[PDB]
């Protein structure tokens, strides 16, 4: 007997820990002891689906002593409506119901067109340069940033202001530097606000603006920009990088993408199901149980944490046969959870698949000798933070 403790170590940079794939054989829920509070750990698809569709499972914390957390973790759950048990299901219902219709199928075949362009610009500019090259910062990091400045309606240099601003919000280790940035944050977009109230544009500002005749405060109005500007930007940069070094560690399914870039949503969707980086920590989606639960022969008390665990789900090979292997040509493959699923499902995924589907149709076919220019074992993802990431990919072509 030997509680096993979160995180747990990964020996490769990419992949499950060994002892999360040893607990998922094992059955699908595990005590488990972590940095903080004891939780249960669900490793199962089938049981971590079922769970992220059950209401009695919420971010928010029931506890009348609740436990301690991270400043990047009390932002996180703030910015997501979470941080008041008590009013988290009239403010959870109210943040989709805004921020849902701001992702519409005008908007969004609209930004598909830009996004594309932007990628023939971003890698010409990438195959005229000379290597060694840092793709995380020439591409990873300009795509999703460029798509946040056109959500929220402002110049594209604006990114280079806030183009930080997600990694130190979500620092772990420092709870002022977190606290610092996210007043940052909270600066510039009570400044968008008000600018939007006088020079409205097509944007998600201005439209929250004009929302139920003005009903809105701008403090409102603000929160919800900041979930847009924190969220959705650098999970995808992630995203891209861990894309690119699942592709260049599959030479075969790189070629198949190459010559047809017609399976470029297949592998968006094998990249998602695949890619996480590290110790996995931001592949665990937090809960507590607000009323008792079965899993299994397993109780699930009032009050308890559970950590779905997202990442060892997508790898379950009673969910996808082979689980561990990269293939973009499973017929019928059951839907990842790299997105979550029921009350929280990511309002954000077809923007997302958007963009990763015009990256890697591009990709390999403009940079067919496209490379690591260092071994992959110097690549370094950051566990400190809640997206975790890399902080650089050097390359050659
Ligand atoms: C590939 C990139 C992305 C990944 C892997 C991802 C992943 C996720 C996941 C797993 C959740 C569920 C959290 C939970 O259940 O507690 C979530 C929620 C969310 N995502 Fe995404 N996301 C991505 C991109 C985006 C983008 C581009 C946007 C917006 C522009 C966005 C906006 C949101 C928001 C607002 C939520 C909160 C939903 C809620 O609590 O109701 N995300 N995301
Ligand atoms: C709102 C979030 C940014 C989306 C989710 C994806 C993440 C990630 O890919 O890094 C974040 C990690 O931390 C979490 O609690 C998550 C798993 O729910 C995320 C919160």
Redesign the pocket.
């Known amino acids: 007997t030997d509680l096993p403790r979160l995180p747990f170590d990964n020996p490769d940079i990419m992949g499950i820990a060994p002892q999360m794939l040893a607990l998922q054989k094992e059955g699908p829920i595990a005590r488990v002891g972590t940095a903080g509070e004891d939780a249960w750990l669900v490793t199962r698809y089938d049981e971590v689906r079922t769970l992220?569709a059950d209401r009695r499972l919420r971010?928010s914390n029931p506890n009348p002593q609740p436990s301690a957390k991270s400043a990047a973790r009390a932002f996180m759950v703030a910015?997501?409506?979470?941080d008041d048990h008590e009013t988290e299901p009239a403010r959870?219902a109210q943040?989709?119901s805004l921020?849902i219709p701001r992702?519409s199928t005008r908007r969004l075949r609209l930004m598909k067109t830009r996004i594309e362009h932007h990628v023939d610009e971003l890698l010409d500019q990438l195959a005229a340069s000379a290597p060694p090259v840092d793709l995380h910062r020439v591409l990873s990091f300009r795509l999703?940033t460029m798509?946040?400045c056109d959500?929220l309606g402002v110049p594209l240099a604006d990114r280079e202001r806030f183009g930080q601003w997600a990694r130190g919000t979500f620092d772990q280790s420092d709870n002022e530097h977190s606290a610092n940035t996210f007043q940052q944050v909270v600066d510039y977009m009570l400044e968008l606000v008000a600018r939007k109230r006088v020079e409205p544009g097509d944007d998600i500002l201005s439209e929250l603006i004009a929302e139920k005749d003005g009903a809105l405060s701008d403090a409102d109005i603000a929160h919800l920009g900041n979930?847009?500007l924190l969220?959705?930007?650098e999970?995808?940069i992630?995203?891209i990088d861990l894309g690119t070094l699942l592709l260049l560690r599959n030479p075969v399914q790189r070629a198949q993408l190459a010559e047809d870039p017609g399976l470029a949503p297949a592998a968006v969707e094998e990249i998602?199901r695949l890619?996480v980086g590290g110790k996995g920590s931001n592949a665990l989606?937090?809960?507590y149980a607000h009323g008792d639960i079965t899993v299994g022969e397993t109780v699930i008390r009032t009050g308890d944490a559970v950590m779905?665990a997202?990442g060892a789900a997508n790898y379950d090979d009673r969910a996808f046969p082979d689980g561990g292997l990269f293939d973009l040509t499973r017929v019928r493959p059951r839907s990842h959870?790299?997105?979550?699923?029921?009350?929280?499902?990511?309002?954000?995924?077809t923007?997302?698949?958007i963009?990763?589907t015009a990256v890697f149709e591009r990709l390999f076919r403009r940079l067919p000798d496209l490379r690591l220019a260092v071994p992959e074992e110097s690549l370094r993802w950051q566990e400190h933070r809640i997206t975790g990431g890399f902080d650089e990919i050097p390359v050659t072509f």
Request: charged share 15%.
């Open positions: 992220l971010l910015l997501c409506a979470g959870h943040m989709r921020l992702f999703p798509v946040v959500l979930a847009v969220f959705g930007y999970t995808t992630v995203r998602l890619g989606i937090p809960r779905l997202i959870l790299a997105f979550g699923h029921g009350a929280r499902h990511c309002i954000g995924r923007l997302a698949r963009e990763l």
